[PDB]
Amino acid sequence: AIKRGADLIVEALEEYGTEQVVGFIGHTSHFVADAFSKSHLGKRVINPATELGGAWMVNGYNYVKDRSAAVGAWHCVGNLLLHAAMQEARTGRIPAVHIGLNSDGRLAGRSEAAQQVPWQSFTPIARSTQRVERLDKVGEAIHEAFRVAEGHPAGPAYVDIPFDLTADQIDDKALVPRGATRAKSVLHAPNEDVREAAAQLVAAKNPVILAGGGVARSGGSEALLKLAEMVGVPVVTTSTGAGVFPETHALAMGSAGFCGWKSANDMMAAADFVLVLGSRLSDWGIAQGYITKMPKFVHVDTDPAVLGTFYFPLLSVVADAKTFMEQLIEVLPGTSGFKAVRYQERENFRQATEFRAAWDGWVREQESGDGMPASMFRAMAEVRKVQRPEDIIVTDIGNHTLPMFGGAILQRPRRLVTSMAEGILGCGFPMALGAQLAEPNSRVFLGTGDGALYYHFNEFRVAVEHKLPVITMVFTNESYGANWTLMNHQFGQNNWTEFMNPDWVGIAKAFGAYGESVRETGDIAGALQRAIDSGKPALIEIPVSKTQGLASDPVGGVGPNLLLKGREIPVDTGGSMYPGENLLHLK
Amino acid sequence: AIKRGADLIVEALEEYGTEQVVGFIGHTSHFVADAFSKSHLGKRVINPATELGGAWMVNGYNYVKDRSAAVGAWHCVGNLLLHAAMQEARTGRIPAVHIGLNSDGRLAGRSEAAQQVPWQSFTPIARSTQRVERLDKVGEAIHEAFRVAEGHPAGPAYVDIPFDLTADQIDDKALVPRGATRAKSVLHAPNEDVREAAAQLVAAKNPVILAGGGVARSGGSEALLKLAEMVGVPVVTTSTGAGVFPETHALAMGSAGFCGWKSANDMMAAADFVLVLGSRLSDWGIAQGYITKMPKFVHVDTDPAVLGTFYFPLLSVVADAKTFMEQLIEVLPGTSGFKAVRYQERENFRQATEFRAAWDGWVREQESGDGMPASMFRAMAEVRKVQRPEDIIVTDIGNHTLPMFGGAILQRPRRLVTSMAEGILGCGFPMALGAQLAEPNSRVFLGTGDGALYYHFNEFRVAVEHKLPVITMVFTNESYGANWTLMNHQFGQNNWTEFMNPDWVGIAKAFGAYGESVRETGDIAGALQRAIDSGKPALIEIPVSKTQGLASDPVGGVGPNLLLKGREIPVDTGGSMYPGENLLHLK
Amino acid sequence: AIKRGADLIVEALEEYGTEQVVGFIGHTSHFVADAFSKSHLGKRVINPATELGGAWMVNGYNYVKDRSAAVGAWHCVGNLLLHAAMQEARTGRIPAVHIGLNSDGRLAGRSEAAQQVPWQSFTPIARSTQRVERLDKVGEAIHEAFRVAEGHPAGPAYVDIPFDLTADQIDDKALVPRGATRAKSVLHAPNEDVREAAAQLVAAKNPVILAGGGVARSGGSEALLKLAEMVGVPVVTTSTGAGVFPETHALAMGSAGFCGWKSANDMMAAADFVLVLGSRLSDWGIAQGYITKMPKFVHVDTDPAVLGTFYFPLLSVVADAKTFMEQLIEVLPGTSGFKAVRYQERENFRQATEFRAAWDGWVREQESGDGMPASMFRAMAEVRKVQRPEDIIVTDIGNHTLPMFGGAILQRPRRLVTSMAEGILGCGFPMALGAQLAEPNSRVFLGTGDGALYYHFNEFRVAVEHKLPVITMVFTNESYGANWTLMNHQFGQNNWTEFMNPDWVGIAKAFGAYGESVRETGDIAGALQRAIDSGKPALIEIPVSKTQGLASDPVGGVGPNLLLKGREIPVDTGGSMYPGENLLHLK
């Protein structure tokens, strides 16, 4: 059948499992938008206030789904706004396909052409960058994009299509590849390696299991619970793994790292052996700026590139996390020295429970005291009273990240969302909208700084039109508070940190969202109830200090090195000069 | 003397003429912010709501200054938001230096590193991209950046500096290059080329002088007035040249092009010879999608690359525009066939005056729409009543661009501002703030669509804190009106074009800006008076139709070909298959 | 201890298993060469006539070793010659680390600098490209290079180090990472998948096992022999897999593809099921220009990227080839319908033996006839009389490739060497020298075209000095014979194909190599004996036809499409013009 390139693009997106399109109109995307209006997918399209806001929605949706279920489709120059969100998708392992409709291929390369997008700008960012030259390659290019995006590692794929090809027509026989294939992901470890891990767990006096985001991607919660109880070993997570182990369990230490729980950092410092499952031991994660000292450890991952790049394990294993845990459960009875004992009776139990109890007591101290300014830990204690296991916690980047992570107590995977890998400010609100679109049965609670909310609050138009009832707490301190705090310490003076806020209640109301301030009332609990009952997106203005959180609260961190110290560097030797130095010797 | 890298950066920026810093804080920019606080540039640093908003401010400031007077200084991952504004600076010939402070060079290249910015993403966009490896190269790199940015062609330079080098210290002897000078820019044409151009001008029956943005950069307004009056030749401009010739003059036809004045398009269609001065004859400028038919023409530019790339001149000349005009003025009396006659008595005068009268009559007809919705041409007629010769007109991108360009009547150069080269939506409000910073005592009037204002209205924070009294008219139609209208024409249906507005007056009030709607009154005149009286940034909501402007108003354009018609393309031949086609051959 | 960067580079190369250095001197590699002279590795350095010749030696060495045992070390501008060999290493899956010593980092970025190598030229070619900015990163960068080079997929890594860092000194504590870690590669398939493969083999009426180069990397020869005999299934290879199954066995069909054995192409055309092990089903391999029709197939590979990119399998499996075969051997007794029967008694045996017998008879016909010009198949029959199982066959690219592949009958893996993935002319002689260096106990026989030998015969100085007794047959036809033959057919006329040869015997003798021509004697057998007995590198000049081989001999191929047919393409529509077309409408 004769088909337009635009129709073929939409067919290919349908073929590879697309559910949610985030699209922006312009003449180069006109044919694609018309094709979508005639398709199943057209029913769900989101048109964001800006392309970067929309790209953040794609990231939030796909982070919680672990596949490229959301896709971007963008008119030429709007692709120029994608880079920040695309970078997070790369290092944060978020599958995400973006289709850019460039200007006419006839005009490409002319020096005075308008809107000829430099697609090569994405080469260092996307895991796959393709410029489509020919109409008969559109299906093929989209097929490749999904294959790369949904691999190990997951990440973004960008496809640049000059828009004349979307208007052009061709016979469609076999053009869109049908019935795309996939190998099982349940990669099994060699039995020798499973035996070695079991022997190390037995021998250890105070072992820990460290579960990262790969346990979530693997679907390994059930196996992890069975394993941890069988051996009686405390469980630490990364921030993307939090919730794969119920965080109310006696063996739950929480997340290690600089915005994590002190119980987890205490356990990592005490442990004589770690079993690492599905973690990349990253800079702003377990490595803490490449300062953390790891105990001897076994490292199990599906991506060989993460194994041994920086921390050299005792034993490295390429395997699926769930599968490896199941193999270990089978081998343990039978391992020399293993005995079945209730975890509460193991010799290492008291230590771990003491670490957790000390952390819980400190958290309760931070929750104490009503009135203003509010403690962000108290705000999260109020959320917990109305929070269900399926509900999602979102944060932005700042002082506030630490209380959001410390007050999030999670029972299911993929319930904690931010720009994890790159710490890109402004992510929180649009990622929360993407997560809400993906998980319509979840309540989504966002704790955002004021400096953060400034970026993409224009997306309230999406939240209101599409009935996405995110509950946003905007923590106001009229500052980039992490930076105020750190610069005061570093230099004795903050600079570039202070700003004015609008009346955020008035902003919300101007969009038809629910708005309430607790500046005068302190009534966080009531505001949450009213926000929830409204059925609207909501904004609750909560004054906080400039200093509470990341830059100040002690959680047992060792890094990263935000307050780097300079070194005195020698000048160059040899006779070569600086530019312009000729004039100093005589002109 | 031993100095920190951050201090050396500030010294280099001061040496090369920086007047205004737009900066965003984070740990990687802490030392640079601290160093700026010790400089006279500190007192008035602009900290924008987002880095892309700030990069648009840099563009607006530098467009009106014709040098890199404003500079950007950005914490690592915030650099990822620069690309759209940087692309406009490249093709739009806006000098602009951006300093990106990357993460620690010690950590660069580690696969699980956080915030290691891919500076190579700028290579296809900036005119100069440099990664500084060594502290002793910081002065040298900044010297190079200004050299490239302020050359011919002008454009953006990006300098990536790992922030450890900003904390490190070194002896400073000769390190910052001092006393840089440029060659004079007053390039003279060969006398024979001047004589040939004079002979063509005098021989032509219906000549035109086409003056582009290069006449503004050259400072050629006085020479252009003398030349046009001496020979009695109508003047057409590009949109960046508008205002170099007073647009109230009898010989002023206005700007040619698809959002220009019909008088100019009429004149270009009638002309038998064109003298092109300081224009690149671009796609969305004079070329109109490479459809415009140029008469025989002489082409004078400082950049050899624009001469003969697409339109082949009768004679190409490398020269400064002002200088070439002065040369021509000198040779005209000695040119056979030249006679000194008042311009009003030349044979070609009546034709040109008829074209201008017909255009002016059409514009007047558009000023009497006079209901709700209001006419955008009426809004500009009201602006003109309170507009001085030094005041600046800004627009965004949409249906509204055409009435903004058509209602702008200018007497001085560099008074019309937008994303000229790339048409990037959202530019208008932050570019207007940048222009206002550059010229504190000029009045700045912005006409913006609603879809456009959605992008960067977060920068009201800057406008209110810094008391930048930009007068913004938001034209409301609850749509991307150009797209609504044109899709209805192309397909019989529009898709992706409609959205809800907030209460824009309420948004302004929530920020502390002046806000008023004329929906019930039509009182644009009174709203402008009250907005000006306020002394604040102002937002005036003006309801408009979905269709008025670019999509519906004929101005004699021929292109560009954006509603392109597809072609039927043959399938490939030979035996090669599509991916997945193997399955189709199984029996 | 205080160490120079040069000393640290050599320590790191030793740490990660380097055996063979191929290095080229110049001031930027002076410190590195001095450091090598004080190391174990210095004893084995090869200094090639050119850097591209040396890079081909690295490829030949590492192709046969399956690890980056050979490394390149190059003075600045000599790195500019690496790209061709580096590209083969990428697509041909050859591990290969190259260390480039650039010019002084102080001078980098200066516009009029000499010998500042553009290392970014390698970004699209190497699997890893690193520019080292800091002395304390030299060990780290080299560690990363080996990790990427020796992964799945294997490939080249390039490290660019400004040479000042090689002269600079630093305390060495912990700087070179010690005890680099690695996971086992014996990846096991899910038992369900092994069961499915067994069920498909049972059900099939005339199955085939297709073994590629991954079976060689895996070390799977023993398992493949046991499997093939147990099920009684014919074995086809790719050209990099040839020799993993003894090619004198009754079940050996040889290599499929356009330069392969007709018995293998016949079997692939007849088969109702294929088990593909360790093949990427490549363009100039099994795909034959994406024309080959695959029967339903199971595809087993360690690299998920090759699985389903173009040919969609019935079942895709991520597993090590040897391991998967061992799993299959265990499950087969017990699979419904499996019965133990001698392979000679299976119903499918006669068909396969008939295909092999027909091919062998055709090969014997091509060997018949002595005298001149010689048949290249007869030359290979003469080699076979003096060829041991450990010996290596090398070819270059041309008509001659087909008889080299068809006359190579191999019993062990990694005995067939060329530029497999990219077909880069000239590879053969230097790859043969690299293979000889790696396998000093092998006799190495090269069959090279004359056009090919012209490239790197300058490397005879290496062969003679280092006593590398490669036996080279130069097939003379005074032509690029593949192109003469194909162009005569395509156009009726050859162009750019003919050239003169030197007296190749005189060339060999001028280098101190053994030289002999059979132009007058026809005595191939005697020349081989004399060449072998000389103990020198040898060159035997053998006249051949312009036409025999790739471009003419029928081996059952279907592609690739060398003689592509053009299509008539429509002109563009719309009014836009070509550059310069303005002058045709009136100037």
Ligand SMILES: Cc1cc2nc3c(=O)[nH]c(=O)nc-3n(C[C@H](O)[C@H](O)[C@H](O)COP(=O)(O)OP(=O)(O)OC[C@H]3O[C@@H](n4cnc5c(N)ncnc54)[C@H](O)[C@@H]3O)c2cc1C
């Ligand atoms: C301000 C801020 C503060 C932060 N604070 C912390 C903190 O305190 N603690 C913290 O941990 N992080 C923190 N982060 C997040 C951190 O930067 C990283 O994003 C995070 O630690 C990475 O998690 P991960 O190691 O589990 O790997 P992920 O990025 O989640 O990647 C998944 C890993 O699992 C592997 N994998 C995927 N699927 C499977 C499978 N089926 N089986 C096996 N392996 C699989 C992948 O190959 C990869 O190695 C912070 C971020 C910011 C911006």
Ligand SMILES: Cc1cc2nc3c(=O)[nH]c(=O)nc-3n(C[C@H](O)[C@H](O)[C@H](O)COP(=O)(O)OP(=O)(O)OC[C@H]3O[C@@H](n4cnc5c(N)ncnc54)[C@H](O)[C@@H]3O)c2cc1C
């Ligand atoms: C929605 C939209 C509608 C538009 N409609 C129009 C329209 O109707 N008409 C129109 O003209 N544009 C229009 N534009 C703008 C257009 O895209 C270009 O930005 C503009 O036409 C370029 O102007 P220019 O040719 O004068 O060159 P500029 O981009 O202003 O560049 C300056 C030129 O002068 C040269 N130069 C610089 N200094 C000197 C010197 N000292 N002496 C000599 N030469 C010098 C430079 O080398 C260069 O060639 C539109 C843009 C948009 C987004």
Ligand SMILES: Cc1cc2nc3c(=O)[nH]c(=O)nc-3n(C[C@H](O)[C@H](O)[C@H](O)COP(=O)(O)OP(=O)(O)OC[C@H]3O[C@@H](n4cnc5c(N)ncnc54)[C@H](O)[C@@H]3O)c2cc1C
């Ligand atoms: C002139 C010319 C003619 C040619 N003619 C032919 C021809 O007739 N026939 C032919 O076959 N080729 C031919 N070639 C070579 C061809 O271009 C390819 O180089 C070759 O076919 C690729 O072999 P392969 O598919 O086995 O994969 P390789 O390139 O050998 O790659 C190895 C594959 O095995 C996988 N792998 C690696 N280790 C393991 C492991 N442990 N377990 C499982 N999988 C593993 C890899 O991921 C990869 O998919 C020709 C080349 C030229 C230049």
Ligand SMILES: Cc1ncc(C[n+]2csc(CCOP(=O)(O)OP(=O)(O)O)c2C)c(N)n1
């Ligand atoms: C795009 C971007 N720009 C700047 C930063 C630097 N940064 C990190 S945290 C932070 C403070 C954010 O302020 P806010 O959201 O108010 O949070 P607070 O620190 O006050 O809790 C900043 C500016 C960043 N990470 N990303």
Ligand SMILES: Cc1ncc(C[n+]2csc(CCOP(=O)(O)OP(=O)(O)O)c2C)c(N)n1
């Ligand atoms: C970043 C970006 N995204 C999308 C577009 C495509 N575009 C061009 S004009 C336009 C309409 C803008 O709407 P508005 O500002 O309301 O103006 P109107 O057409 O209603 O006058 C759009 C979406 C663009 N040029 N840039």
Ligand SMILES: Cc1ncc(C[n+]2csc(CCOP(=O)(O)OP(=O)(O)O)c2C)c(N)n1
């Ligand atoms: C670098 C390079 N240049 C050119 C070619 C194209 N090419 C492929 S085969 C061939 C013929 C080589 O001639 P020769 O070595 O004499 O072999 P013959 O065809 O005569 O057997 C040529 C020119 C190539 N593959 N690589």
Ligand SMILES: [Cl-]
């Ligand atoms: Cl547009």
Ligand SMILES: [Cl-]
């Ligand atoms: Cl940050």
Ligand SMILES: [Cl-]
């Ligand atoms: Cl040299």
Ligand SMILES: [Mg+2]
């Ligand atoms: Mg804040």
Ligand SMILES: [Mg+2]
């Ligand atoms: Mg609008």
Ligand SMILES: [Mg+2]
């Ligand atoms: Mg030849």
